[PDB]
């Protein structure tokens, strides 16, 4: 296929954040 | 108006935003917040920092895991010539095509940033080598760092006891530790370096297969148990060595023999191990010192109690210092902090002049962004040390239960204590500052002469009674001979502790009037820093202005105006205030090494000599000389060598500056225009009904003394971070 290891910066530095900024808006409510 | 945050309660239904911040910073204050019992608490710090050890292995794992498939190693173990190792692959979509420009560093493909941590000379320096042979790291450490969590839970679960009272022994534990732990923790290390590593160093490999078949010698552990040890240390190593490949190897573990080498500085192969061994009796001999049921040894009172050396007939008690250091848990976490604090620098000031690694200084970078992350911290501790021993005095402590008793008296005879402290500073103040302006009024004025400049006598002195065999000089009984030692000679001080002047890496650098100042201005730091911590502490209890300053002691920052006008007079806000001088010592000191080192490398040393005896110059050549490299690195003419660094370095100057708000602002002014600024929304369309769930406010009146700080700090500590690196790397040195 050739040259393709780019997912562990969005799933982390991008999407993991989405989760918790969403999710953890559990501090406000759930 | 609902109910939320699951531990506190006053916090829990507070309608503002404080609701949030103050949630995320009471978390770790177990002792006294809703959910707590002396049984809860303890354990609630126990399976906490089992949540510790735990996070230290997901760190170390990955440290060994951005290394094994890229990030040169079956390189840098071919010969580690000072050209740019590697940490991990930098990958940001924001990068330009000058992805191609250095940043992208030689051997490896896509861009990267190289080990300035030491790891790379100790995953190597205990052998650990071959790139087929290597790719363990996480694999273990992590099949470890999970167990680290398992007790966490297991010992959190009631049943198979989490243990409650059993947390105030001592004797048993620490009768256990400083044997079980340290001793065998050493030993077992003594174990490893020696069977698997020393061989890996001077000699050859060890194959993952054999571990019995490999035998440092032909005829085994030979005598050894045969009290006959000695004949380890004969033809041990050599010097015509070629490090790692035998040939001039020889094979007789242990020594104190041979010494330095242009091919590696660093403590000899063996010595870091007889030592590791050698101490491993004493602690094991130490461990087994107190009770633990069987009925020997000692009760940890009854040798305090009426122990006492100068007490006896000097009317000055010693009562249950045990049930107060024990019933305290803060006394605990701050005799803990320090020791660590005092030794974190003993680590990191000995880690130079005596680095124990295969290529390190003669690396001279990693060596200079590693003395300091151990100078920062270390300073950073000390403070916290001094800060949990002004919490003991308020939450815990017990005047009726401690008195005539020597922890008291310490309180009682306190006004002197800060004074005969403050008298040190004020002296150590203007007297350093006469000498340094005077030294700067005289230059500029044309007269380099007239310059006031004291040799650091009692310094060099310590060293012409060592090895500083600098240009002769007797000393009455010593001469440079007649008497030498007589009682000592060809044993012990052989080639070692014989570096002398060695303009390159002699251990001891040859001290003059430049050093008889910084050295009095690191002394005006921890003194001033501590008149405030000593003070900070020596009445979190109260005083004249605030007499009854308590039931909460620590962070009650502020009080009403009137009385004289009262302010940052919580023992926290003196801690708060302290942390600026711990950030000013731990700078004079670090600042100093480097200028020195820098100059003492790819060039002179006269430089620090007549140009550190004054002040302007400390700014001009150093500070102003030696930044060069970095800043013309965003340059109007494309991104050259470093770019991370300089942008960090201005990221450095912003995070800092932006402290100040927090710091010259003070909640009053902020809250009030938010009173006007929360008349907007409510009064503006396409943004009405739209309810907050937390009431717009301005930061708490302690909170922002923190945040400006916890802000002042990174900026500051993230600026030298990028400063030194961004210039120990270029050089010239």
């Amino acid at each position: 296929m050739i040259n393709l290891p780019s997912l562990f910066v969005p799933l982390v530095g991008l999407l993991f954040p989405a989760v918790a900024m969403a999710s953890l808006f559990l501090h406000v409510e759930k | 108006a609902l109910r939320i945050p699951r531990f506190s309660q006053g916090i829990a239904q507070d309608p503002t935003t404080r609701r949030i911040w103050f949630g995320i910073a009471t978390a770790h204050d177990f002792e006294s917040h809703d959910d707590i019992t002396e049984g809860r608490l303890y354990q609630n710090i126990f399976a906490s920092h089992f949540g510790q050890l735990a996070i230290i292995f997901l760190w170390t794992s990955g440290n060994l895991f951005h290394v094994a498939w890229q990030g040169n190693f079956e390189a840098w173990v071919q010969d580690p010539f000072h050209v740019r190792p590697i940490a991990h692959a930098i990958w940001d979509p924001h990068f330009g095509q000058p992805a191609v420009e250095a940043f992208t560093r030689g051997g490896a493909l896509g861009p990267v940033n190289n080990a300035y941590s030491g790891v790379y000379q100790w995953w190597y320096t205990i052998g650990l080598r071959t790139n087929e042979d290597l790719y363990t790291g996480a694999i273990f450490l992590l099949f470890l760092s999970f167990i680290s969590l398992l007790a966490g839970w297991l010992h959190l679960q009631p049943k198979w006891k989490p243990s409650v009272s059993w947390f105030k022994n001592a004797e048993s534990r620490l009768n256990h530790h400083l044997s079980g732990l340290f001793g065998v923790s050493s030993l077992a290390w003594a174990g490893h370096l020696v069977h698997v590593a020393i061989p890996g160093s001077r000699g050859e490999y060890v194959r993952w297969n054999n571990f019995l078949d490999v035998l440092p010698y032909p005829q085994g552990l030979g005598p050894l148990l045969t009290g006959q040890w000695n004949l380890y240390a004969q033809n041990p190593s050599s010097s015509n060595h070629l490090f790692g490949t035998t040939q001039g190897a020889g094979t007789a573990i242990l020594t104190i023999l041979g010494g330095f080498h242009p091919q590696t500085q660093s403590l000899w192969l063996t010595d870091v191990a007889h030592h590791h061994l050698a101490i491993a009796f004493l602690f094991l001999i130490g461990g087994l010192m107190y009770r633990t049921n069987f009925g020997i040894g000692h009760s940890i009172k009854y040798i305090l109690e009426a122990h006492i050396p100068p007490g006896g007939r000097l009317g000055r008690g010693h009562k249950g210092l045990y049930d107060t250091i024990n019933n305290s848990i803060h006394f605990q976490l701050g005799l803990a902090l320090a020791s660590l604090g005092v030794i974190t620098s003993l680590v990191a000031q000995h880690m130079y002049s005596l680095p124990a690694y295969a290529f390190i200084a003669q690396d001279f970078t990693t060596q200079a962004a590693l003395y300091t992350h151990h100078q920062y911290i270390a300073g950073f501790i000390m403070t916290g040390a001094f800060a949990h021993g002004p919490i003991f005095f308020i939450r815990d402590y017990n005047p009726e239960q401690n008195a005539d008793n020597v922890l008291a008296r310490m309180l009682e005879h306190k006004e002197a204590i800060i004074s005969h402290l403050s008298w040190a500073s004020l002296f150590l103040g203007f007297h350093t500052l006469g000498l340094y302006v005077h030294n700067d009024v005289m230059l500029a004025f044309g007269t380099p002469e007239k310059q006031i400049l004291i040799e650091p006598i009692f310094a060099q002195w310590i060293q012409s009674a060592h090895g500083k065999t600098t240009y002769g000089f007797d000393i009455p009984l010593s001469s440079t001979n007649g008497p030498a030692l007589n009682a000592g000679r060809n044993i012990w001080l052989p080639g070692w502790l014989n570096a002398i002047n060695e303009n390159s890496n002699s251990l001891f650098l040859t001290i003059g009037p430049g050093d008889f100042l910084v050295h009095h201005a690191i002394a005006l730091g921890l003194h001033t820093t501590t008149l405030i911590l000593v003070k900070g502490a020596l009445d979190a209890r109260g005083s004249k202005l605030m007499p009854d300053k308590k039931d909460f002691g620590y962070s009650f920052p502020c009080d009403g105006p009137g009385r004289g006008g009262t302010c940052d007079i919580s023992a926290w806000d003196d801690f708060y205030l302290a942390v600026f001088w711990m950030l000013n010592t731990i700078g004079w000191v670090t600042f100093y090494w480097h200028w020195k080192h820098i100059t003492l490398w790819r060039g002179n040393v006269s430089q620090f000599n007549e140009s550190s005896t004054y002040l302007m110059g400390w700014l001009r050549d150093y500070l102003w000389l030696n930044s060069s490299q970095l800043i013309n690195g965003i340059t109007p003419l494309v991104c050259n060598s470093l770019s991370v660094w300089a942008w960090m370095f201005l990221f450095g100057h912003l995070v800092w500056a932006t402290g100040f708000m927090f710091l010259i602002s003070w909640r009053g002014y902020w809250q009030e225009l938010i009173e006007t600024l929360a008349w907007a929304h409510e009064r503006t369309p396409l943004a009405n009904l739209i309810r907050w769930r937390d009431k717009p406010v301005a930061l708490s009146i302690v909170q922002a003394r923190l945040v400006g700080l916890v802000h002042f700090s990174v900026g500051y500590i993230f600026t030298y971070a990028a400063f030194l690196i961004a210039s120990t790397s270029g050089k010239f040195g």
């Binding site: 296929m1 050739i2 040259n3 393709l4 780019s6 997912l7 910066v9 969005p10 799933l11 991008l14 999407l15 989405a18 989760v19 969403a22 | 940001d92 979509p93 924001h94 990068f95 330009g96 095509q97 992805a99």
Partner: protein, 31 residues
Amino acid sequence: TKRGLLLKFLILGGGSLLTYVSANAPQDVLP
């Protein structure tokens, strides 16, 4: 408009396909 329990679905789905293929690419056109 079947919203009756969702959003968790559209935040794995939609946001694994604004980022799955969205980062990857068969022949760079690099950073």
